[PDB]
């Protein structure tokens, strides 16, 4: 029920209202729309206070009182119309991930490495 | 200025270009505003910090950073007052410290990613192709 | 008009009056595209906009 | 008397030299008219 | 399904912060007492509804001089149906 | 020490005492800029002393670029004389130095950071902005440009004595933060 979620529902929620439009009247009128893209989701990490960012392992999350999340990324179509005519990738948040999901580092990792990952197999 | 002070006080340091590329402020009235803001708290009473975050996006390992520190450390003390806007020399430190390495960090990559035309990178490294000799700790 | 010129003299007098430059160069050499050395030139220029 | 009538567009100068670029003018030198499209009057200033 | 981002994360994550590059795309990038009197009389002669600010914008003269010109050479109307009209 | 600051710019103001025609004045003088829609004053100059005259239609006029009070005064008088040449009843009056710019070098490299920390209330210093330290003195009220090189620029003085007192007061502190 999480692998289902991260894969599909996340996107279908975006695709519902990618678009929303603002039309400025002139004295020929303007019309501004903005629309989203397909959603991109990272492999989990932390923004440390200094500024540095880096991958994070579930173990270190527990003892740094961190949060096992991965970021989100979507495409933005900023555009304009003037009104009948039209003249990158965007961060949108951090998503915690159910452990042992495809997006978690561990959903593949080897049993031996689980020891090197200090996670009880 | 209300945040750079906090940052400059939160032990983190950012260039003006940086928050300027967060907020357009034309930097001058700002520069005075920050100057006068500093002198405000003066009466209401460190170029290394950038290097980690610099290489942090560069996906580098710490040695080049640490090496860059002692390089940055050595350049300032002796001579070569080095940089006048010395985040320049902070960068050439990175580049020459990756000139210490074989790892792919073209100043072409550096400049477009650290936002300095490579001319000072050459020049910084230039006096440091001369000052590499006394820049051999390891 | 297709000729290209280049005057390099010494400005003795010059004046600006309502978007009108004046200039007065003495002993000024003009390059063509050739060089003709003319002592006396009176330069007065107005806005073309 | 060698009075050339041209329109200025751009002038460049910092306290030692004049650069009055001239467009669409005539240069009358030695009774010979000089028709030019672009000019760079590089006057020197003591 | 979803394209995860195969890059390591500094390169993916340095961008959406301070990429140092801005405005890549264009998107919502947004007087003489004699001369003033003669012009004020002219516009009043040209138009009885010679508006003051419209006179100031058109005459391209200092506002104080134009109003002084219109104060005596034009009918200074600030009340009534023909508001801001100097006839 | 034994170092005297070298005056680099004296700014002075002079009253001519008559209404000028900036078109006529610019047109007849040998050396005078005046663009109305860029700046409402004749920007006039001479060669000896090499100065710049900021001539307003009011007859108010500003001289800078002189490196002495006497040269500033002489330049002002020459400018007034050339105005008189045109036919305006110009008079060189109310000459008054508004700024004196000085500079020098102590020749020894300085520790700006210990300086600014040690003299914060008078020290403003953002090397990422300006390679030099701003030092603002109380008496004389002269503000100093302090460079690690040992280069100094003194400014804000109505009198060169203020420049000299300025450097004399700053020199002990310079020697203090001399990096050795």
Swiss-Prot record, chain B:
Compartments reported by the entry: Nucleus
Coiled coil spans: none
Sequence repeat ranges, renumbered to this chain: 54-130
Family statement drawn from the similarity comment of this UniProt entry: Belongs to the TFIIB family.
Other facts noted in the record for this chain: Present with 6750 molecules/cell in log phase SD medium.
Role noted for this protein: General factor that plays a major role in the activation of eukaryotic genes transcribed by RNA polymerase II.
Quaternary structure and interacting proteins, as annotated: Associates with TFIID-IIA (DA complex) to form TFIID-IIA-IIB (DAB-complex) which is then recognized by polymerase II.
Protein's name in the database: Transcription initiation factor IIB
Underlying gene: SUA7
Entire protein: shown range: 174 to 326 of 345
